[PDB]
Amino acid sequence: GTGYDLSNSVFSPDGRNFQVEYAVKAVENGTTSIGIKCNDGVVFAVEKLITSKLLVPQKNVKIQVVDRHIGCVYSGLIPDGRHLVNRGREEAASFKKLYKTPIPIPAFADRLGQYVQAHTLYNSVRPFGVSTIFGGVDKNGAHLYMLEPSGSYWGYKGAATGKGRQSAKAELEKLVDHHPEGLSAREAVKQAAKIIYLAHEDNKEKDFELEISWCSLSETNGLHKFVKGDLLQEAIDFAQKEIN
């Protein structure tokens, strides 16, 4: 029969969970966001669609910090992302409380993973309507991750999600090939700005706003910080020039 796609924890005859697959659709419908891992850190960037002149610029911050050393960005249902980050923050506090050290990024990845997977186990809950790009610096270097509505996650050299994920993935793949020796923090920021400008064409009708954050061993000491003023404007220019 049918109806296999009306309830969350239900396996279809081919072993799929359609409700999760439907969540992915909401993700694909979202703004494009990305992460680039560099030689000693990680860079996150995202497209903010300017719906109106009335949206105060620089105000509606999308990138989110967890603990002091982890950045999170997501595409899809924005509230769903905040919910996940709220949990991540609890998840990290609990770890730090018992173990004293700040949570390793792989450890934190699984925390989010297990939680997201939990929301595919019961028909009394709905799967998460976001894919999340997150990472930071720990005891053994930089880590970048992307997590899907199924709870699937892996480590990434570079990652993208949302409307322009294909442009971005193509742009990311080139960097991997033209720089096998490892990008640097400053370069990955300029590059980040470029990649968002290039996935913006898949939505070129509405203006947009750029947001970048980074966590680098040498540049931010390991701490997640936002990219502001001069370094943001310099990144904007590099992208604005490489669009022509």
Partner: protein, 233 residues
């Protein structure tokens, strides 16, 4: 299609839509129009109040949350009572525990997170109301738009409710003028009443028909109704 996926908030449609949330959004559109706008010194709410009969009262649209914060509503009024009340408590908790006036931005995030919980769990329902939140905090004047989906946006100006698109285009046009209307409350309200009148159709905005609210630099959030709004008609 749609009929099979709109039973509750726990169900995704094949295109990734959540229809119960979209249906909640429809209660906003059916609500009476309300406007919000701010300078760097003040923030203003203007609301068109609706009556049932000419023998009925006009139902209140503006609620105060703290001395520095308040909101206007469009949609299910009880839902606004529940949400303003929660906000009142959060405003209150910040003062008692931290001796700190709650950041309007932070109130934004709290309302988002509270609405969200009702969009992912069984037996719950989305909230059926839109809210416009103005306040004056440690970083100045603020205006927020709350949608029952959980989406909260900071703006210079906006409007929600029936025929709200009128005022929204007016504010979008006026932007550069009103953002500067600092240290003059009566002129910011005038711009707000002019914004709200761009969404009139049915009738004119009368004395017991208008509701205005103001907060800023040295002005605690205060509600104006009736005779007290006369000088703006």
């Amino acid at each position: 299609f749609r009929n099979n996926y709109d039973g509750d908030t726990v169900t995704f449609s094949p295109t990734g839509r959540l229809f119960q949330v979209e249906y909640a959004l429809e209660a906003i559109k059916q609500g009476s129009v309300t406007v919000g706008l701010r300078s760097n010194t003040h923030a203003v709410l203007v609301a068109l109040k609706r009556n049932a009969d000419e023998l009925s009262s006009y139902q209140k649209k503006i609620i105060k949350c703290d001395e520095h914060m308040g909101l206007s509503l469009a949609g299910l009024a009880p839902d606004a009572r529940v949400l303003s009340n929660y906000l009142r408590q959060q405003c209150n908790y910040s003062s008692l525990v931290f001796n700190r006036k709650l950041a309007v931005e932070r109130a934004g995030h709290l309302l988002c997170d509270k609405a969200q919980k009702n969009t992912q769990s069984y037996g719950g329902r989305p909230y059926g109301v839109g809210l416009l939140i103005i306040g004056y905090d440690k970083s100045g004047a603020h205006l927020l738009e709350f949608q029952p989906s959980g989406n909260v946006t900071e703006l210079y100006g906006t409007a929600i409710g029936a025929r709200s698109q009128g005022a929204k285009t007016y504010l979008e046009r006026t932007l550069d003028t009103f953002i500067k209307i600092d240290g003059n409350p009566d002129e910011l309200i005038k711009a707000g009443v002019e914004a709200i009148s761009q969404s009139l159709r049915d009738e004119s905005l009368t004395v017991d028909n208008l509701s205005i609210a103001i907060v800023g630099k040295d002005t605690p959030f205060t509600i104006y109704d009736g005779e007290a709004v006369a000088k703006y008609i």
